[PDB]
Amino acid sequence: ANVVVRLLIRRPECFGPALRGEGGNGLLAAMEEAIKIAEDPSRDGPDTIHMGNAIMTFYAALIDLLGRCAPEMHLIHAGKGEAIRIRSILRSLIPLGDLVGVISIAFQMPEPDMSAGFCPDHKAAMVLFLDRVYGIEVQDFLLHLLEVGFLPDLRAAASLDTAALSATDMALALNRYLCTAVLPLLTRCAPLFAGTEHHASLIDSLLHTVYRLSKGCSLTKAQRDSIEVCLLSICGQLRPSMMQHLLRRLVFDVPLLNEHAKMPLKLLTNHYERCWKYYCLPGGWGNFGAASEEELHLSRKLFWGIFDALSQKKYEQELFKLALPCLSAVAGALPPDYMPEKLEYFINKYAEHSHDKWSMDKLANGWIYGEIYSDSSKIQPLMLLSEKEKEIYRWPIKESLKTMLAWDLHAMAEMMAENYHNIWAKKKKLELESKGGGNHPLLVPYDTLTAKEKAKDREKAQDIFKFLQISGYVVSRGIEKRFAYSFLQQLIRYVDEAHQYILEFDGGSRSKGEHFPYEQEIKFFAKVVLPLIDQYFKNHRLYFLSSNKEKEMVTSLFCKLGVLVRHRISLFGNDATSIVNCLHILGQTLDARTVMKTGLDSVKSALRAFLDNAAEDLEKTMENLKQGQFTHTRSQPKGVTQIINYTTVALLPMLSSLFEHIGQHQFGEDLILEDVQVSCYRILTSLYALGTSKSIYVERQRSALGECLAAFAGAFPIAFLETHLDKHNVYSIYNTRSSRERAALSLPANVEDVCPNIPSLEKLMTEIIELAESGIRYTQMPYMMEVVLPMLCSYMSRWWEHGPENHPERAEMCCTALNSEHMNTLLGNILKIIYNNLGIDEGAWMKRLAVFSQPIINKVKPQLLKTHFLPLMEKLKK
Amino acid sequence: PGQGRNNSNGLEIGCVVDAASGLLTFIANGKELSTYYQVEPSTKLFPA
Numbered sequence: 001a002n003v004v005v006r007l008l009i010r011r012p013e014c015f016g017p018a019l020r021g022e023g024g025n026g027l028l029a030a031m032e033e034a035i036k037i038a039e040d041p042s043r044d045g046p047d048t049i050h051m052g053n054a055i056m057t058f059y060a061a062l063i064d065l066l067g068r069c070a071p072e073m074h075l076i077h078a079g080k081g082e083a084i085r086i087r088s089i090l091r092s093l094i095p096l097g098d099l100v101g102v103i104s105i106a107f108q109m110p111e112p113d114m115s116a117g118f119c120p121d122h123k124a125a126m127v128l129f130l131d132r133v134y135g136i137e138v139q140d141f142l143l144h145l146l147e148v149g150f151l152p153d154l155r156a157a158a159s160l161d162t163a164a165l166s167a168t169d170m171a172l173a174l175n176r177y178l179c180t181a182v183l184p185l186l187t188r189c190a191p192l193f194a195g196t197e198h199h200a201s202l203i204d205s206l207l208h209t210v211y212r213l214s215k216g217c218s219l220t221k222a223q224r225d226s227i228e229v230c231l232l233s234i235c236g237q238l239r240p241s242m243m244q245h246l247l248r249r250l251v252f253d254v255p256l257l258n259e260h261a262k263m264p265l266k267l268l269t270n271h272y273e274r275c276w277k278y279y280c281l282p283g284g285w286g287n288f289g290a291a292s293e294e295e296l297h298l299s300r301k302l303f304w305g306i307f308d309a310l311s312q313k314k315y316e317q318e319l320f321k322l323a324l325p326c327l328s329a330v331a332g333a334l335p336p337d338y339m340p341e342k343l344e345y346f347i348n349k350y351a352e353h354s355h356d357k358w359s360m361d362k363l364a365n366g367w368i369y370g371e372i373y374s375d376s377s378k379i380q381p382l383m384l385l386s387e388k389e390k391e392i393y394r395w396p397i398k399e400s401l402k403t404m405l406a407w408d409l410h411a412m413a414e415m416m417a418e419n420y421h422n423i424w425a426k427k428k429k430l431e432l433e434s435k436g437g438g439n440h441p442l443l444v445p446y447d448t449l450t451a452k453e454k455a456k457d458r459e460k461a462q463d464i465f466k467f468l469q470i471s472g473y474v475v476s477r478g479i480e481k482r483f484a485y486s487f488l489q490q491l492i493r494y495v496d497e498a499h500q501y502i503l504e505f506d507g508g509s510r511s512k513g514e515h516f517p518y519e520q521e522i523k524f525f526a527k528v529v530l531p532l533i534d535q536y537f538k539n540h541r542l543y544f545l546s547s548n549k550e551k552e553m554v555t556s557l558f559c560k561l562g563v564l565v566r567h568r569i570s571l572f573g574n575d576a577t578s579i580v581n582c583l584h585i586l587g588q589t590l591d592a593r594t595v596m597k598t599g600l601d602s603v604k605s606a607l608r609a610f611l612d613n614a615a616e617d618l619e620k621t622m623e624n625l626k627q628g629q630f631t632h633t634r635s636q637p638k639g640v641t642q643i644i645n646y647t648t649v650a651l652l653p654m655l656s657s658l659f660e661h662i663g664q665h666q667f668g669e670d671l672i673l674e675d676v677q678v679s680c681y682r683i684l685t686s687l688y689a690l691g692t693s694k695s696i697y698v699e700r701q702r703s704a705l706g707e708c709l710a711a712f713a714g715a716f717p718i719a720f721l722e723t724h725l726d727k728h729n730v731y732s733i734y735n736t737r738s739s740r741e742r743a744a745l746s747l748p749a750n751v752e753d754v755c756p757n758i759p760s761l762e763k764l765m766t767e768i769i770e771l772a773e774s775g776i777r778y779t780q781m782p783y784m785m786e787v788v789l790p791m792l793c794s795y796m797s798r799w800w801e802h803g804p805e806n807h808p809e810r811a812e813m814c815c816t817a818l819n820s821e822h823m824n825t826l827l828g829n830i831l832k833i834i835y836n837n838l839g840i841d842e843g844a845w846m847k848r849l850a851v852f853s854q855p856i857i858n859k860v861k862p863q864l865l866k867t868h869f870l871p872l873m874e875k876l877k878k
Numbered sequence: 879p880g881q882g883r884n885n886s887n888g889l890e891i892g893c894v895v896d897a898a899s900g901l902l903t904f905i906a907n908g909k910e911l912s913t914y915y916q917v918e919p920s921t922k923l924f925p926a
Contacts, residue, residue, distance in 0.1 A: 033887075360883045363883075363884060364883070364884075364886055366886070
């Protein structure tokens with residue numbers, strides 16, 4: 001490149017005569033003269049060679065050579081001063097304005113036309129030179145280039161889109177040059193034109209023209225990919241408010257779910273995920289603004305359109321996996337709480353007021369009364385427009401009134417302006433067809449066109465609507481619980497339908513080689529709707545503590561899903577984890593206080609029944625594991641295996657999440673009472689016995705067993721291990737319920753008999769002291785070092801919050817005897833055990849013990865430091 | 879009346895201050911306004 005540049009600068013005779021300084025004609029004038037050569041047969045004088053085409057190709061080749069011999073890349077140019085000299089020489093060689101002119105020289109849309117004239121390869125050469133040599137950085141420069149020549153080529157592409165017009169080789173070649181010109185924007189200056197809006201007209205014109213291009217026919221796969229990347233970049237870093245028209249177009253086009261729908265699906269996905277606050281938060285995306293009511297309505301319409309369209313659509317792995325992020329993004333963006341004679345008199349009054357306005361304007365300009373309406377002498381008979389002009393301009397007013405009567409005020413004015421623009425475009429298209437001429441770019445609608453042309457009609461529409469509201473005529477087109485209730489109601493109908501499909505599929509015998517349509521619907525649900533609900537409860541207020549009936553529907557859906565998982569977990573072979581995660585988030589978002597108050601009584605009783613079913617499954621698992629039937633047991637019945645798998649996998653962590661949420665939000669005192677208390681004691685006994693059992697599968701699933709038991713202990717507001725102290729507690733089931741009522745509820749007259757298997761609280765004291773003395777370890781006695789030491793830790797945390805030291809006034813009322821001294825004793829036992837563990841390489845459980853004791857580290861006396869904290873950390877230092 | 883739409887040169891309001899008598903008078907496009915003010919001795923008035 002260096003030597004080529006040296007030779008060219010030493011001998012400018014290699015260049016075109018126009019480029020040489022001897023003539024100084026200029027590159028743009030050279031191409032204009034080449035066009036003239038092409039037009040003039042004598043200029044293109046006597047397989048044949050077009051003389052102007054030869055000149056033009058020569059100049060394009062020279063420009064391409066200079067652009068390619070320019071400095072390679074920006075850092076090379078910056079570091080190499082010689083590269084700076086070369087770039088300066090090329091800049092002085094070729095003016096920038098000449099490049100803009102040549103890139104603006106447009107083509108002739110063909111009825112074939114012969115390839116003679118300016119060509120897309122010529123434009124590609126000039127744009128390559130402009131991009132490489134001069135650089136394309138300044139924002140106003142980008143906008144000026146976009147408006148000059150760049151957008152016109154896109155308009156030509158929009159024209160050429162049609163089948164025969166694409167059959168034109170001009171369309172084909174222009175597609176190539178169009179890729180070579182569209183890749184620039186994004187790669188070089190995606191951020192800038194998307195960071196400014198100085199020509200918002202140009203912005204919208206670019207967006208919808210590129211979109212119409214993307215709705216092409218003969219475009220190659222790579223071409224379509226390039227267009228899609230361009231659109232995604234521009235949208236994903238352009239202002240949300242300034243492509244709302246494009247939002248509209250995608251809103252109509254996405255529900256088609258055609259092959260072309262993939263690109264808009266990505267577009268909306270990125271748009272909503274990007275500016276999520278803009279469509280949800282009250283202030284939106286900060287200075288970017290917030291989604292107007294119209295934008296929210298369009299987003300909701302698109303949301304339900306895609307929802308129903310995917311519901312009706314046959315399940316496709318690729319298409320639905322691509323569409324799921326879009327629907328999730330729109331759900332996240334949508335706020336959870338989002339919701340004649342008079343006209344003739346108006347015409348007369350507007351005519352009078354307009355006559356007054358014309359008189360005032362003409363006298364302000366300096367008009368005089370006269371028969372002629374010519375503006376050369378400033379004479380008017382309507383004191384520019386004459387009486388005939390006024391009476392003919394009366395007609396469009398009546399036409400607009402009739403149109404919008406057959407169909408707020410500003411929106412209707414915009415609609416009327418679009419209607420008048422469309423009718424004018426139709427009239428001019430008819431005139432062009434009659435005259436046998438080419439179609440002007442103005443034929444495309446207002447949205448496809450720039451915003452500047454809209455303003456001309458918008459001013460008239462605003463004026464006529466101001467006159468209408470002055471006259472006194474208003475014309476148009478003609479709960480926050482409901483938002484969630486609608487989309488959650490789609491979910492509940494989905495779940496009821498899925499229940500029906502599973503019941504029918506189980507009732508009917510399976511056919512080998514024939515897949516059930518019900519099973520297909522189940523798969524579609526579990527692969528589309530099932531992931532969607534968790535994304536719903538994420539980033540949405542559905543428990544309305546930040547819609548009580550919304551909370552009720554959430555609880556009822558939880559009950560239905562829990563029943564479905566309990567009965568037919570085996571059917572969800574691959575979506576079991578997804579549905580269990582949805583159960584977790586349902587418990588996290590569940591308001592048990594609302595389950596108790598302002599919650600449908602049948603729904604809350606169904607929740608009690610589901611918890612009782614969980615207790616029954618836990619009891620069955622108890623019996624199976626005691627008998628020796630588990631996963632490791634080969635001789636295990638199918639139903640028993642299903643019960644054990646369901647319990648250990650799903651039921652433990654799910655109930656763990658529910659009880660953790662209940663304990664965190666103090667929901668135990670409201671949801672858990674009476675029969676719920678009895679069933680919770682049953683669950684407690686089941687979990688205790690399952691943990692006590694020393695089966696290998698129990699050991700494998702020990703973490704979830706303990707996690708659930710601790711969650712239950714925390715959530716519960718009443719005493720169930722204070723065997724000889726439950727009488728003091730006011731909340732006690734023995735204090736509230738009578739002996740006969742407890743007997744009916746299947747509870748004896750002694751709390752010791754209620755919980756005989758579990759050691760009493762004092763016996764637990766003695767056992768923990770024995771742990772501290774004997775130095776137990778998870779190797780010898782794992783059951784209560786890493787499984788139940790957390791249990792007694794959480795137990796004592798709860799009862800330490802409710803104990804006498806925290807409530808000296810209620811010390812007698814506090815059934816528990818756990819104080820700060822017991823708190824220190826338990827923490828010291830934990831650290832004594834940790835010290836016994838210090839010096840082994842199997843203590844993966846110590847970190848777990850740290851987690852268990854983390855809630856109870858900051859509520860101890862300072863006396864424990866010298867006793868235990870120092871020895872452990874000294875040995876750690878060792 | 880009518881000068882808001884008929885006057886191409888705009889509105890000119892001329893203020894005259896007679897300091898010997900402390901009198902403020904106003905004229906609108908050559909027409910004397912009925913509104914006038916009387917100020918106290920030793921008062922400093924700022925055009926505003």
